[PDB]
């Protein structure tokens, strides 16, 4: 499975945040509630997709950039990436004011 790094990331409000994981990018809510934020390749037909969640692809190495732009305080929480064609281990983000 992919790595999804760092194991936890802490940033200030308005500061970008990026992880390194078809490729999906979820945030985990309770009771096994999971919502996809962005995906490689981009999902056009996804209702109400949040533009500030980007999943650029690096040159190679199967490297990827899960970037959330201009973070919000409520963006803090539980994030993981998966591959579809197997989860990768849980990497975190907290937002500071």
């Amino acid at each position: 499975p992919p790595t999804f790094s760092p194991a936890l990331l802490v940033v200030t409000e308005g500061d970008n945040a990026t992880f390194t994981c078809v490729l999906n990018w979820y945030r985990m809510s309770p009771s096994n509630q999971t919502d996809k934020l962005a995906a490689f390749p981009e999902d056009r037909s996804q209702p109400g997709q949040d533009s500030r969640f980007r999943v650029t692809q690096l040159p190679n190495g199967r490297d990827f950039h899960m970037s959330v732009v201009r973070a919000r305080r409520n963006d803090s929480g539980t994030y993981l990436c998966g591959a579809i064609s197997k989860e990768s281990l849980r990497a975190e983000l907290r937002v500071t004011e």
Partner: antibody
Amino acid sequence: QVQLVQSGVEVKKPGASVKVSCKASGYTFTNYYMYWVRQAPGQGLEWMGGINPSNGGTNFNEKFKNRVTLTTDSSTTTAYMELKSLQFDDTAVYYCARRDYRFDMGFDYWGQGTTVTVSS
Amino acid sequence: EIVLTQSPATLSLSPGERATLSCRASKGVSTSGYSYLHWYQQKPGQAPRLLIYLASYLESGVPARFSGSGSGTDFTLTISSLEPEDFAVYYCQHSRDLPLTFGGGTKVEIKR
């Protein structure tokens, strides 16, 4: 049990509004996006909009913008389609179709269809 | 905006001959090795039924008699050995961008 069931037939007057329901059962409701397709009698298919039930985000064909409201209810796993200011050319069969939220693998499953007729 | 034009409008063959449908997009519906092109089968008075998704992939439960191919922007739905059920309309639809659109459909008939 991967099957959507839509509400009953509708016969409305021009200028009225109609609210069609689509009840999903037996899959993880928020694990699939809901889309609405219509088809005038003896014609092709026309996409109207899509909704993400996990947060309520929406897609819209611009021909129906500020004329269609798509709502969802997680409790009853039921999506709704409200077409206001009904026109004569809105006479069609209105479908709800689900799509995988992980990636687009096509509208695998469709409702039985709701016939809406606009006339004076 | 993208429009798909299925060529051509109507075909008609006996329950055995090869059926080849075409879907012909206005612009490119393929990106990063994926073509947002699906095929549905609609028999009169019922909801559509998806057969091929993402240009090549076949939907579960659908007989292997159906096959999807083509890429970049050209696509073709291929049916080899037909059965009496197979005569109906077949639509293609793109998800490359918004709004989602469908082809006008191709009706396959029984030639006598």
